[PDB]
Design a protein around this motif. Structure first.
Motif, PDB file in Angstrom:
ATOM      1  N   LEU A  95       0.946  -1.346   0.060  1.00  0.00           N
ATOM      2  CA  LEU A  95      -0.088  -0.076   0.064  1.00  0.00           C
ATOM      3  C   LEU A  95       0.872   1.156   0.143  1.00  0.00           C
ATOM      4  O   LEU A  95       0.655   2.214  -0.743  1.00  0.00           O
ATOM      5  CB  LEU A  95      -1.016  -0.103   1.150  1.00  0.00           C
ATOM      6  N   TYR A  96       1.947   1.017   0.882  1.00  0.00           N
ATOM      7  CA  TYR A  96       2.863   2.395   0.792  1.00  0.00           C
ATOM      8  C   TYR A  96       3.262   2.770  -0.642  1.00  0.00           C
ATOM      9  O   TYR A  96       3.412   4.009  -1.028  1.00  0.00           O
ATOM     10  CB  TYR A  96       4.146   2.223   1.828  1.00  0.00           C
ATOM     11  N   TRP A  97       3.748   1.658  -1.409  1.00  0.00           N
ATOM     12  CA  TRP A  97       4.505   1.920  -2.855  1.00  0.00           C
ATOM     13  C   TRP A  97       3.202   2.358  -3.553  1.00  0.00           C
ATOM     14  O   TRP A  97       3.415   3.057  -4.840  1.00  0.00           O
ATOM     15  CB  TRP A  97       5.578   1.057  -3.232  1.00  0.00           C
ATOM     16  N   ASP A  98       2.180   1.444  -3.716  1.00  0.00           N
ATOM     17  CA  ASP A  98       1.090   1.611  -4.745  1.00  0.00           C
ATOM     18  C   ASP A  98      -0.143   2.271  -4.389  1.00  0.00           C
ATOM     19  O   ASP A  98      -0.610   2.579  -5.550  1.00  0.00           O
ATOM     20  CB  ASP A  98       1.185   0.143  -5.069  1.00  0.00           C
ATOM     21  N   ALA A  99      -0.481   2.301  -3.334  1.00  0.00           N
ATOM     22  CA  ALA A  99      -1.840   2.980  -3.171  1.00  0.00           C
ATOM     23  C   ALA A  99      -1.886   4.366  -3.329  1.00  0.00           C
ATOM     24  O   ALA A  99      -0.743   5.027  -3.373  1.00  0.00           O
ATOM     25  CB  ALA A  99      -2.413   2.630  -1.773  1.00  0.00           C
ATOM     26  N   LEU A 100      -3.038   4.996  -3.658  1.00  0.00           N
ATOM     27  CA  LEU A 100      -3.118   6.500  -3.644  1.00  0.00           C
ATOM     28  C   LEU A 100      -4.057   6.870  -2.369  1.00  0.00           C
ATOM     29  O   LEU A 100      -5.092   6.284  -2.400  1.00  0.00           O
ATOM     30  CB  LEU A 100      -3.919   6.743  -5.148  1.00  0.00           C
ATOM     31  N   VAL A 101      -3.630   7.728  -1.699  1.00  0.00           N
ATOM     32  CA  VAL A 101      -4.427   8.174  -0.769  1.00  0.00           C
ATOM     33  C   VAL A 101      -5.437   8.767  -1.165  1.00  0.00           C
ATOM     34  O   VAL A 101      -5.775   9.297  -2.339  1.00  0.00           O
ATOM     35  CB  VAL A 101      -3.721   9.133   0.618  1.00  0.00           C
ATOM     36  N   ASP A 102      -6.631   8.485  -0.229  1.00  0.00           N
ATOM     37  CA  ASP A 102      -8.020   8.998  -0.625  1.00  0.00           C
ATOM     38  C   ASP A 102      -8.532   8.332  -1.993  1.00  0.00           C
ATOM     39  O   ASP A 102      -9.431   8.794  -2.353  1.00  0.00           O
ATOM     40  CB  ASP A 102      -8.141  10.600  -0.512  1.00  0.00           C
ATOM     41  N   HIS A 103      -8.149   7.141  -2.043  1.00  0.00           N
ATOM     42  CA  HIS A 103      -8.733   6.370  -3.266  1.00  0.00           C
ATOM     43  C   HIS A 103      -8.832   4.843  -2.940  1.00  0.00           C
ATOM     44  O   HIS A 103      -8.050   4.766  -1.799  1.00  0.00           O
ATOM     45  CB  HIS A 103      -7.644   6.342  -4.647  1.00  0.00           C
ATOM     46  N   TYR A 104      -9.560   4.233  -3.507  1.00  0.00           N
ATOM     47  CA  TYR A 104      -9.777   2.909  -3.125  1.00  0.00           C
ATOM     48  C   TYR A 104      -8.593   2.112  -3.321  1.00  0.00           C
ATOM     49  O   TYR A 104      -7.839   2.397  -4.113  1.00  0.00           O
ATOM     50  CB  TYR A 104     -11.033   2.063  -3.915  1.00  0.00           C
ATOM     51  N   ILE A 105      -8.355   0.927  -2.686  1.00  0.00           N
ATOM     52  CA  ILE A 105      -7.148   0.316  -2.687  1.00  0.00           C
ATOM     53  C   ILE A 105      -7.141  -0.464  -3.994  1.00  0.00           C
ATOM     54  O   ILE A 105      -7.923  -0.677  -4.724  1.00  0.00           O
ATOM     55  CB  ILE A 105      -7.157  -0.882  -1.594  1.00  0.00           C
ATOM     56  N   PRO A 106      -5.833  -0.681  -4.546  1.00  0.00           N
ATOM     57  CA  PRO A 106      -5.315  -1.404  -5.507  1.00  0.00           C
ATOM     58  C   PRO A 106      -5.818  -2.599  -5.804  1.00  0.00           C
ATOM     59  O   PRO A 106      -5.916  -3.302  -4.705  1.00  0.00           O
ATOM     60  CB  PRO A 106      -3.878  -1.410  -5.739  1.00  0.00           C
TER      61      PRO A 106
END
Lengths: 115, 115
Positions: B87-98
């Motif tokens: 999640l640290y590398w790939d997720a966007l904050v304030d968006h749904y999970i990858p």
């Protein structure tokens, strides 16, 4: 030092640094990267630095700008994902590299000497 | 989106966020952590959020403060190192999970439902 105090030292030495990105890239010998994710600057000068020093850590789109500046300034950049990650999590900026990263950092610097 | 534009989106949505740490922790359902390194906030409310949402990312000594605040606010925190990293590398904050993190995030949320 506990893992907790190490984390405080990492954050503090990041926050106390007062250098801009170009200055950080220019003063480095090489940049170790994980493209689009991480860029770590390494400085190593024989007889000046007793060990390689970590000069900076940048992430995400900042890595694009580091690549642009490195090209302008003649600082080579190498893709080394495991080393970039390990330095990202464990190294202190403006300090010598962690012991665990000696072998991989020396491999990068042998490459740099060949370049 | 190229990996490069993804990295720009991640950095931008991090920078545009205008929430303090307590507010970020309080609005989360659970915190997924790698101790001393990473804390990621996840929000999931049935019939409100169609998917789990990433609320925040903090690192190093900030994780200590997140743990302190989570205890005060009654937000559980779980050690899940691979999920926290991904999640640290790939997720966007304030968006749904990858998509790739659906299985692991659902496992955390089944745990949360049991808690």
């Amino acid at each position: 030092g506990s893992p907790e105090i190490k984390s405080k030292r990492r954050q503090f030495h990041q926050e106390i640094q007062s250098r801009n990105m170009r200055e950080n890239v220019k003063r480095s010998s090489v940049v170790v990267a994980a493209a689009t994710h991480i860029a770590i600057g390494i400085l190593y000068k024989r007889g000046e630095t007793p060990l390689p020093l970590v000069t900076f850590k940048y992430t995400d789109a900042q890595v694009q700008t580091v690549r642009k500046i490195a090209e302008e300034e003649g600082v080579p950049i190498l893709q080394r994902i495991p080393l970039a990650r390990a330095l990202y999590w464990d190294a202190l900026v403006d300090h010598y590299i962690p012991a665990e990263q000696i072998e991989a950092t020396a491999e990068v610097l042998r490459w740099l000497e060949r370049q």
